[PDB]
Structures are given as C-alpha cells and as structure tokens.
Enzyme design. Sequence first.
Site, PDB file in Angstrom:
ATOM      1  N   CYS A 123       7.614  64.856   1.410  1.00 32.12           N
ATOM      2  CA  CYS A 123       8.508  64.025   2.225  1.00 32.12           C
ATOM      3  C   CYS A 123       9.818  64.685   2.614  1.00 32.12           C
ATOM      4  O   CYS A 123      10.418  64.286   3.600  1.00 32.12           O
ATOM      5  CB  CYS A 123       8.804  62.666   1.561  1.00 32.12           C
ATOM      6  SG  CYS A 123       9.840  62.630   0.065  1.00 32.12           S
ATOM      7  N   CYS A 178      11.820  61.729   3.635  1.00 31.70           N
ATOM      8  CA  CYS A 178      12.952  61.613   2.725  1.00 31.70           C
ATOM      9  C   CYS A 178      13.936  62.788   2.827  1.00 31.70           C
ATOM     10  O   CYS A 178      13.647  63.820   3.432  1.00 31.70           O
ATOM     11  CB  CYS A 178      12.426  61.483   1.293  1.00 31.70           C
ATOM     12  SG  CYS A 178      11.770  63.025   0.611  1.00 31.70           S
TER      13      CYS A 178
END
Length: 234
Positions: free
Chosen positions: A74, A156
């Site tokens: 991520c 992320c």
Amino acid sequence: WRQTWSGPGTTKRFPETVLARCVKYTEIHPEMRHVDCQSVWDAFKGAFISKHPCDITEEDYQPLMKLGTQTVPCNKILLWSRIKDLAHQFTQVQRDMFTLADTLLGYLADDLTWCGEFDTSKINYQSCPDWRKDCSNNPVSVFWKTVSRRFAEAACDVVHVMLDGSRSKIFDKDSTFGSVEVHNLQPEKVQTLEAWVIHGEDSRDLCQDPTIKELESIISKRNIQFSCKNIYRP
Ligand SMILES: *[C@H]1O[C@H](COP(=O)(O)OP(=O)(O)OC[C@H]2O[C@@H](n3cnc4c(N)ncnc43)[C@H](O)[C@@H]2O)[C@@H](O)[C@@H]1F
C-alpha cells in the site's frame, strides 16, 4: 429485445483470454494459489451476462472483487491519469512501485471490451455501449470504477500519481482518477499525494496549472498533504 450499440463489441476470444491470463498470473504470483481461475471466470461472467448493459452496478462486480481480493504494498502505489503506457513503463525500471495493472483483476481486464444482453446468456460480440454515446453504466466502465474505488481505498502513506502535461486538463476532475480515486484516498491512512506532471507542450512550471491547483485543494480538504513535481519524459 436487443439494440445495436455505438461502441466495439466484446473482444474476440474473451473467455479464453481471461482464463489464460488468470492461469498465467497465479503461476507467477504464488501468493494467489488459493484462487481457482474457473471460479474467477464464473464470477466475472455473473457480473454482466444476462443483464442490460446500461444497468450494470458496482454491486454486480462484488463477487468478482471478493474472489480477486489481494493484499498490496500500500505504501508503493503509483496511480495515473490518461498516461497508462508511460506509467507501466516507469514501473518496469523503478520495479518496487505497484500499479493497478500489476493486480490480478487489472491484469485480467487490461485493454479488453465486454458486454452481454438482458435476453440471453451469450456474450455480445456484435457491439457494446459507448460511454459517451450510449450510457455510462456499461460493463467495462463500471468494472474499472469498482476496482479503482477499491484500489484507492487500499493505498497508504505516500501515494504517487503520474499526470500528462500534454493534456488540455492535466488534472481532469471528471476522469476516474479525478472522481473515484481522489475522493477515496483515506484521510488517516494516506499522509501525502505526490503528483508527477510529465512533459514530452509548454516547458515551464506546470504545477501552477489551474487544474493542479484544483487537485491540491481537493486533496487538502481530505487532510492529506499535497506535493507536485515537474518531470521530463525521455
Ligand atoms: C484508476 O484510475 C487511474 C486511471 O484513471 P484515468 O483518469 O486515466 O481514467 P479515465 O481517463 O477516466 O478512463 C477510464 C477508462 O480507462 C480504461 N482503463 C483504465 N485502466 C485501464 C487499464 N489498466 N487497462 C485497460 N484499460 C484501462 C477503462 O476503459 C476505463 O473505463 C488508474 O491509475 C487507477 F488505477
């Protein structure tokens, strides 16, 4: 009753291509042996077969999303808008970055077209809806919309996006990146969006383009830091 559509029909050999791509992907990536490609194809089919191709919903693709669920790195996601081939080409050199095309679902569906019809269980190889001329809720558009929402939700830390400096709207609010992905980068999870404006057009600071200022304000309201860089294509 069926109608003729304005866009190309389903890619020739669509079933075999999807199955063969799934088999190839699960061979290369061992993390995905728990996937049966026959099951993946069944779920794919159930999303659009025997359905009117302007009434497709993201919910129709949920079974396929569930079977094609895949953890991703991520913190190394590279998003892009209107510059797919150069994006992919960047990640073949900078190998540790990860795009949607590197996921199972993105790999299966790359550059293919597909639809069905309400009255039959057959793939429509004759024609499929054009997103602009016929309808936006067609099997292909809704697929990419669905996986994109989910891909943006997975990202992320620092997320990068490659944008094309040679486009009229370098950032287009109405594109898939600009609607679905930007509005589903999660405030807590993602700390920064770093845009890379690619030149190949005007060769000056393109991070001050009105559409990039738009992008900055959008991101900023989601409590994400925004960065921009002018980068030159070789
Ligand atoms: C999810 O979105 C970006 C790409 O967003 P764009 O802003 O470039 O998308 P847009 O111009 O609105 O076009 C949407 C159609 O593009 C096709 N498409 C997208 N991605 C692919 C791949 N990988 N292969 C083939 N075709 C693709 C579909 O036809 C869409 O309907 C990506 O960076 C994020 F992952």
